[PDB]
Design a protein around this ligand. Structure first.
Ligand SMILES: Cc1cc2nc3c(=O)[nH]c(=O)nc-3n(C[C@H](O)[C@H](O)[C@H](O)COP(=O)(O)OP(=O)(O)OC[C@H]3O[C@@H](n4cnc5c(N)ncnc54)[C@H](O)[C@@H]3O)c2cc1C
Length: 385
């Protein structure tokens, strides 16, 4: 289920502070009559490959972007004439090199030591350590091996089809049913492969869009429900550092409308973490206003404030253990969003340890407690790698 539609960008702006070395974007997108969404839904984005990486390919093959050509034997337009540059928007250009890809290159290689090296990469250990660990691509190996006689049409056909990227919708449909926002951390750094500068495909595509540009996307609803309790007095604990705040911005906007409609709201704790308020404290103004209107209680942790200890949300949670565990005993829902590889597990461990300490039980009893909480639908994750 990818029921995709084309539509316009209504806003696009930077969320980090002037002089941050990093970027996080906020985009507002319009939705057509047929689409609709709910808090905790995702936007599926079909991205385009950026100019830099398209030019690296046409340069390697000595081709002009506009050169029309036709293929025949990825989801490629076959038996149609189509330029090179548009063919190149159908495929992934920076996935690790596959074993099929390596064999194809080896077979077209006429410098013998270079063939020995490409074949070396097929072995189990080398493949794990030099290809997969560093995310070494076919493109980077073609640039390294200019006398590999592979040709464009064989290149294009060996590549995977371009995949969508998911973003947690950061707005509530209770404010505007036909407009949705996303919050996009921009992937950028030195390539782990060693070949220059790395840019994440969808995130840099999204970062470069402007008001009036079009975008192809669809609404996706996750198998794991990530929604507010049915009763607005049921207490919430939300942990969402960095771009993890995204779905909680939707939660905040929802609660704010429910209040404006006379509903009473219970406690809602938002644990937010970032480097610094001088840098990446996304939506600070909105979140401080929300807190002032009693929509949330806000707890921050800063990793890089001069003259302060490095603080993460789990450290703050641990200080607040007693209170957070009493809340969960009264029927609170707990939510985590953001980084699933390090932050989520550590937050989970701190929650269980708070339980163990408060209720004087074993770690096994604390683990069973969390298991039961999840099975009741009260412990939800919107995390990613
Ligand atoms: C359910 C879900 C919800 C999500 N919600 C959000 C969200 O709300 N906001 C958000 O910003 N993202 C979100 N993501 C992540 C998002 O979908 C994209 O994966 C992310 O934006 C990166 O995709 P990309 O195309 O820009 O980069 P890609 O081109 O796909 O590259 C991604 C890969 O590059 C790797 N990489 C990173 N740095 C380097 C480097 N220097 N050298 C080599 N490789 C590197 C990454 O580890 C990753 O493996 C979500 C993901 C999921 C699954």
């Amino acid at each position: 289920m990818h029921g995709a539609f084309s539509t316009n960008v209504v806003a696009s702006k930077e969320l980090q502070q002037p002089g941050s070395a990093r970027s996080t974007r906020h985009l507002e997108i319009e939705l057509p009559k047929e689409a609709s969404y709910q808090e905790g839904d995702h936007l599926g984005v079909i991205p385009r490959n950026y100019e830099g990486i398209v030019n690296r390919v046409t340069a390697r093959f000595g081709l002009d972007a506009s050169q029309q050509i036709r293929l025949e034997a990825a989801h490629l337009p076959l038996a149609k004439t189509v330029s090179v540059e548009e063919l190149l928007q159908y495929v992934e250009l920076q996935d690790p090199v596959t074993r099929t890809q390596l064999r194809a290159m080896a077979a077209k290689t006429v410098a013998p030591p270079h063939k020995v090296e490409l074949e070396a990469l097929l072995e189990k250990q080398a493949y794990k350590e030099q290809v997969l660990a560093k995310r070494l691509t076919m493109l980077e190996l073609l640039e390294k091996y200019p006398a590999c006689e592979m040709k464009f049409s064989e290149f294009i056909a060996l590549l995977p089809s371009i995949r969508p990227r998911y973003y947690s919708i950061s707005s509530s449909p209770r404010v505007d049913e036909k407009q949705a926002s996303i919050t996009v951390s921009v992937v950028s750094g030195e390539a782990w492969s060693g070949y220059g500068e790395y840019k994440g495909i969808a995130s840099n595509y999204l970062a470069e869009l402007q008001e009036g540009d079009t975008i192809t996307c669809f609404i996706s609803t996750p198998q794991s429900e990530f929604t507010l309790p049915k009763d607005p007095e049921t207490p919430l604990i939300m942990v969402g550092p960095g771009t993890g705040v995204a779905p909680f911005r939707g939660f905040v906007q929802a609660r704010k409308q429910l209040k404006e409609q006379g509903q009473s709201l219970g406690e809602a704790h938002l644990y937010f973490g970032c480097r610094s308020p001088h840098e990446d404290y996304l939506y600070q103004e909105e979140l401080e206003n929300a807190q002032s209107e009693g929509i949330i209680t806000l707890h921050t942790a800063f990793s890089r404030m001069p003259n302060q200890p490095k603080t993460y949300v789990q450290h703050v949670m641990e200080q607040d253990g007693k209170k957070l565990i009493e809340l969960l005993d009264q029927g609170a829902h707990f939510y985590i969003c953001g980084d699933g590889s390090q932050m989520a597990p550590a937050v989970e461990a701190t929650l269980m340890k708070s339980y163990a300490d408060v209720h004087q039980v074993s770690e096994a009893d604390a683990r069973l407690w969390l298991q039961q909480l999840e099975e009741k639908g009260r412990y939800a994750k919107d995390v990613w790698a």
